[PDB]
Amino acid sequence: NTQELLDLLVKCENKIQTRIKIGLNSKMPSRFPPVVFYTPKELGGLGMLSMGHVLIPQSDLRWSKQTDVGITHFRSGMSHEEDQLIPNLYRYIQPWESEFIDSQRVWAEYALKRQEAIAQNRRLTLEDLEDSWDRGIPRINTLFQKDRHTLAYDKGWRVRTDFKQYQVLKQNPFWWTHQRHDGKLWNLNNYRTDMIQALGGVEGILEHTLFKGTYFPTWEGLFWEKASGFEESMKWKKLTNAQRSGLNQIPNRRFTLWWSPTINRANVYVGFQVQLDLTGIFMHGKIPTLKISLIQIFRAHLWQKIHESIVMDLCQVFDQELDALEIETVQKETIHPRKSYKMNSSCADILLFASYKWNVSRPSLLADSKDVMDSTTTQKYWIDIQLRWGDYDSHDIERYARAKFLDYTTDNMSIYPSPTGVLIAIDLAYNLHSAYGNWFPGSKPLIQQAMAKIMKANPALYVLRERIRKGLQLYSSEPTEPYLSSQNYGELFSNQIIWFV
């Protein structure tokens, strides 16, 4: 009813949102996406319950899926209606007059049921009464609680709870009624589901949370470490004031790294672009938490290491199957050390010279099937690997692959010994492999399978994934121990060492 109350609550809600934003970075986001502020803490977000009405943009409601067959794309909020908006608090709060009427009706029904069951030579059913569950201003949901006999002794706890302000040094917002005494009057269970599905579903929310940066499909069963070992060390060591602040500033860094894609966009935080010291991650606006987290994850020339790993894996794969590919020489140029994270691939990664001739078709993407090898005939071939870090809006690998191939191949600065070849691209944040350009006859499925196999179990990529899992405190979903022993009993001699007590 009170318009002033709504205005003030929205104003202070925006105040706290701006406080969080300035905590993230000194400047102010141009767009300030609302996925971060409303994703529940179970999914790794602030999960701010709000009484306002903010319509989530459809541009941020899309998500992708890098399936083996192809890169599928979906949009949860594609319905032809009003734009998806996070539901407000009052949408799931019972009216007070409705609360009183329901309390009266349910208590009358409970009294009638008790009177009927008195003659049943037994206690109340407590099962058919479930039709009146979670109702009534008194704790009718707790009317069957075990502590009721213990609770019946207390009389007039309301005054004690009120005077707790003079007793307890901390403010008690729930002084209207005591928890586990008048019961949980407000049912807030559907709110979480409504908020998560209205934000774009679980997958839609996770699409901007670096979840695709972990190869394990830990959609369910994953463990998120709220407190790490450093927290225990700080608690035990009796840290100083600055050390206490540093220990308390850990979860902020944690989820800000966990929210890197949607927080490092281009439309959000407009200004001068900047990349790290020796990597290929572009950040808009100085974010000390994200900067320090990124330089921890990419410590010790990790970008150059993963580039060398992928180029060596490609070279080994090509050498192994050099028979059908008519490969005479498969080598790599004297690549400058800084040319791994460079914006433009001025130096070619892998060169492959065949024996006499090599038919190459027109450039295309790996999803294509048609091929006309008579387009060109060259004796050389080039393969380039593009190490890129996809954002929440620039994660389109196929479009990025096309644009990058067109720019690099058609450029004066870039020097390619062969005019015919294919450029490969790996989105580290998306962990998505793609390629674009010409192909060797019959090598396109071979290159696709090789890329999939390498990206499955690349050493440096696995190390980077483990680093991400540790830094974000997302522990891998725990495996299930073979509690069964019928097979173990037969294979008891097979076990090297076993004992029972």
Binding site: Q331, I335, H336
Partner: peptide, 22 residues
């Protein structure tokens, strides 16, 4: 089916050449 050892380039702490050896 066998795989010969895989070699790598020592770009770090290499004063022999500015570009990585091939």
């Amino acid at each position: 089916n066998v795989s010969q050892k895989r070699k790598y380039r020592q770009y770090m702490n290499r004063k022999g050449g500015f570009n990585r050896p091939l």
